[PDB]
């Protein structure tokens, strides 16, 4: 069933396809181009009750695709540019216009609704960025000294030797290159340069003026919401009085008032035209605030994303700092691991030898006992239980003393210790 809707910019009337009526409101977005209108790229719509037309949301979930509680449409493209039967027929037009006034009220209400969400959404991010930037403002000094420490560490790493035996993991060289080796398009210098580039791009000299501009825009949006919505403050009561008078006159009609009612019907259109005047007056305040807000909106989010990312890489920037002392300690750790592997191998060998000796001797004793009496006397049944083999100790060998550890040399450790920079204490 094809949809029946409203369009305030088009006299509160609209039509759409059946998919627009039942399926996701993206079908309604497509059908906006239909029914002699521009597409949703040049339109904006909301369901009765102010429900914003979410394209993904099913029109069935919207429940406004028919003339009953029909959705209203705001056209952005519009912003981009004998004879007694009349007693009811004239009144017939008025009531629809009267309902249109109510329909008109909903659109402003829906417009206000979006502003409320817009105001909330904008304000929420505002403080979020405000805190973040202030956090960043405080963090500005913190990041700086960190970068200098990173540079000093890079120099030390240059002074620091290369991997020595670890190269064979698969000559004169430094861990700095080894550090620089990984992620060839993303070297350390690239990281530092990107960080400082964001920092400069995060200039408070611009951020603060941008923040002030955003605050002024938000205040202007609030004022427009106060002003444009108030633009039709006096309409409701006057329209109600006119509609009541029209109803009473039509009822009395059952031709002195006939022209009077006809003129009153004509007089209504001027109010309707006057109503249109308030609309575009209000509508201009809407989109202009809306568009500008959207332009500022994502920017802060993008700024936040930029703010977040700068925070993000800052940690990674911080991460590389410990690498020199970390590797210096790691060398000694691997050396201790090798020594422990040696000692453990010796202990395991001694234990295995003793266990093999004892197991062999006990097996010999058991063999002698069996030779004496294995099935050699009925006394075995009565004396059952002694035929057990002796204890099964651990005469076997260990599995592996962490073989996957890479190769290293203690003399290589001494050579590195002699050759290394002041990080020798971290490896002392």
């Amino acid at each position: 069933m094809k949809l029946y809707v409203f369009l305030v910019n088009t006299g509160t009337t609209l039509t759409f396809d059946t998919e627009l009526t039942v399926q996701t409101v993206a079908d309604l977005k497509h059908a906006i181009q239909s029914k002699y209108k521009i597409a949703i790229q040049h339109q904006v719509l909301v369901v009765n009750g102010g429900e914003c037309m979410a394209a993904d949301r099913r029109v069935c979930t919207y429940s406004a695709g028919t003339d009953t509680n029909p959705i209203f449409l705001f056209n952005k493209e519009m912003i981009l540019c004998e004879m007694y039967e009349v007693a009811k027929k004239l009144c017939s037009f008025c009531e629809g216009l009267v309902h249109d006034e109510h329909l008109q009220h909903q659109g402003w209400a829906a417009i206000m609704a979006n502003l409320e969400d817009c105001s909330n959404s904008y304000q929420k991010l505002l403080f979020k960025f405000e805190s973040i930037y202030s956090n960043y403002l405080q963090s500005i000094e913190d990041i700086k000294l960190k970068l200098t420490h990173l540079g000093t560490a890079v120099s030390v790493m240059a002074k620091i030797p290369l991997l020595e035996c670890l190269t064979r993991h698969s000559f004169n060289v430094s861990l700095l290159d080894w550090i620089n080796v990984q992620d060839r398009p993303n070297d350390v210098e690239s990281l530092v340069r990107k960080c400082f580039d964001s920092m400069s791009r995060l200039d408070p000299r611009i951020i603060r003026p941008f923040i002030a501009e955003c605050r002024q825009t938000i205040a202007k949006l609030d004022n427009q919401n106060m002003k444009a919505i108030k633009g039709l403050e006096d309409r409701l009561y006057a329209l109600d009085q006119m509609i009541a008078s029209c109803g009473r006159l039509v009822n009395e009609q059952k031709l002195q008032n006939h022209r009077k009612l006809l003129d009153i019907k004509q007089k209504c259109t001027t109010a309707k035209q006057e109503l249109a005047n308030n609309l575009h007056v209000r509508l201009k305040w809407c989109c202009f605030v809306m568009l500008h807000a959207d332009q500022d909106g994502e920017k802060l989010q993008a700024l936040l994303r930029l703010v977040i990312e700068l925070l993000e890489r800052v940690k990674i920037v911080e991460a590389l700092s410990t690498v020199p002392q970390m590797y210096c300690l790691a060398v000694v750790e691997v050396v201790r691991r090798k020594m422990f592997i040696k000692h453990y191998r010796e202990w395991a060998g001694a234990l295995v030898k003793d266990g093999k000796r004892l197991y062999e001797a006990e097996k010999s004793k058991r063999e002698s006992f069996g030779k004496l009496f294995r099935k050699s006397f009925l006394r075995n049944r009565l004396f059952r239980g002694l035929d057990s083999w002796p204890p099964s100790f651990c005469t076997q060998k260990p599995r592996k003393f962490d073989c996957e550890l890479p190769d290293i040399s203690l003399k290589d450790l001494q050579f590195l210790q002699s050759f290394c920079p002041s990080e020798v204490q971290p490896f002392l």
Partner: protein, 205 residues
């Protein structure tokens, strides 16, 4: 034939821009920041580049070598078009060819000097180089293009509001060149996505 001439000229412009990228790789410039830059950052980046020049020079050599391969292909195609399709021996074509030849000689000289400089470097760092997976030149070109686009967008926002059209056109040309030299559909999808994005953003003008 002038269409083939235009294709050659596009190759030429892509080569020139790639050479500019190579030069920037040789030495980085923070003037693109705009308003200002912390002095320490300049000092820190200076120390870092001084410490890591050798590998940076190596990346420069790889890039220049890719440029040279492009130039050699262009020269072979130039001999071909000379054999047929000279298009009245266009003086414009002659000047384009001469500029290409000068660039090629520059590329050869640069490659020779870089190889001579890296001799000891390539010698000492042989083991890691064997361990290291090579840094694809096309990857470097794409990275320069992407960083340029990002900086241009940041300037578009945050009220720099200048030079955006020039940097945008330049990066569009660079992306088109990379796509022409892409020859790998997997990342060619991403390349086409970026090119379409650049074209769409070009509607701002």
């Amino acid at each position: 034939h002038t269409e083939i001439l235009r294709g050659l000229r596009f190759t030429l412009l892509f080569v020139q821009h790639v050479l500019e990228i190579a030069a920037l790789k040789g030495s980085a410039s923070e003037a693109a920041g705009g308003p200002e830059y912390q002095l320490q950052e300049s000092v820190v980046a200076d120390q870092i580049s001084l410490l890591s020049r050798e590998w940076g020079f190596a990346e420069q050599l790889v890039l220049y070598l890719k440029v040279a391969e492009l130039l050699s292909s262009g020269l072979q195609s130039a001999i071909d078009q000379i054999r047929a399709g000279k298009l009245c021996l266009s003086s414009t074509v002659k000047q384009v060819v001469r500029r290409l030849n000068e660039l090629y000689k520059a590329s050869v000289v640069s490659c020779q000097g870089l190889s001579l400089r890296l001799q000891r470097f390539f010698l000492d760092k042989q083991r890691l180089l064997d361990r290291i997976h090579s840094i694809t030149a096309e990857r470097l070109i794409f990275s320069h293009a992407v960083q340029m686009v990002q900086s241009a967008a940041l300037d578009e926002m945050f009220q720099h509001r200048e030079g955006c059209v020039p940097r945008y056109h330049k990066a569009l040309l660079l992306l088109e060149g990379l796509q022409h030299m892409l020859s790998d559909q997997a990342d060619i999808e991403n390349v086409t996505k970026c090119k379409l994005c650049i074209e769409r953003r070009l509607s701002a003008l």
